[PDB]
Subunit: 95 residues, 4 copies
């Protein structure tokens, strides 16, 4: 493990977008971008599992737009992950 934090991956994407005059796409434009990326993942999941490198890369593509979305709206995905994990966190002492 190197190992990169979620905070750093977000900083890394923020640094890349920061160079452009355009900046982040508007949230609704982002949502279209995500739908587009998800389609490319769907295509690839269907190709390999329907009726590691390509499918690995299409996840990264989706993850990038997600980070963009999250950065655009000042959302920290580590926090986001934690609130989901807390929702699944059972009150059962045996687990």
């Amino acid at each position: 493990m190197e190992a990169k934090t979620m905070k750093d991956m977000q900083k890394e994407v923020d640094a890349y977008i920061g160079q452009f005059k355009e900046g982040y796409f508007s949230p609704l434009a982002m949502m279209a971008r995500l739908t587009e990326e998800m389609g490319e993942l769907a295509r690839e999941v269907n190709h390999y599992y329907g009726e590691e490198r390509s499918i690995e890369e299409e996840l990264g593509d989706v993850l990038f737009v997600m980070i963009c979305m999250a950065n655009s709206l000042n959302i920290d995905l580590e926090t986001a992950h934690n609130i989901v994990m807390n929702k699944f966190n059972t009150r059962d002492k045996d687990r």
Copy 2:
């Protein structure tokens, strides 16, 4: 900041799924789950820009599930996308 690495967040989800007899959804079923979560995100984005923090988390969870299912490390994924966007221009 703690701060949590991508590998840790993936390990964390794998430990959660690992307790069930079922384990992971098959990839095509995952893809359906992912389409489902994306719609919930779309709803929230439209509502606020026509909750987001949580619905992004929800989509991220399914992503991690998908990646774990196929033994894919999302740090490597992120890196190979960053390499693609990385320009050979000395000025940038």
Copy 3:
């Protein structure tokens, strides 16, 4: 009593949206709406295959499709026809 045409189905949706001051969602907002409905379909496909509820969720996506098409003066009969043309091979045996 007899089958409804795609043109009429579009006219029907246009008549319904026509009564509102706001009218059609902008194309990018429609796409968000369409993504939302697709998720509900996905949910229901997963539920039954991972009857009536799935029939309804297809209706929901079809409605937003029609809204999208109407919004951009696109006729879905014509759209469907270019797809059929794209697939209809020049093979005499088929």
Copy 4:
């Protein structure tokens, strides 16, 4: 100049698919196909609104939907009607 009914459009797709040994994709595979086409629609909506290419990509989405519907013996005219009934108001003035 017909014009074409939804039932016929579905019959037309069923006849096209009916020639192949493989037949219809399973519902979960269909859903993946549909997610794929939606992305291509999204791409095209973003390009022009972030138009003839949108007409084609709407068609492609409509095709997979027809496939989906045929696959599960669902009539899309019926589906459309339940959605219209859902929005049908009990208001006498509308």
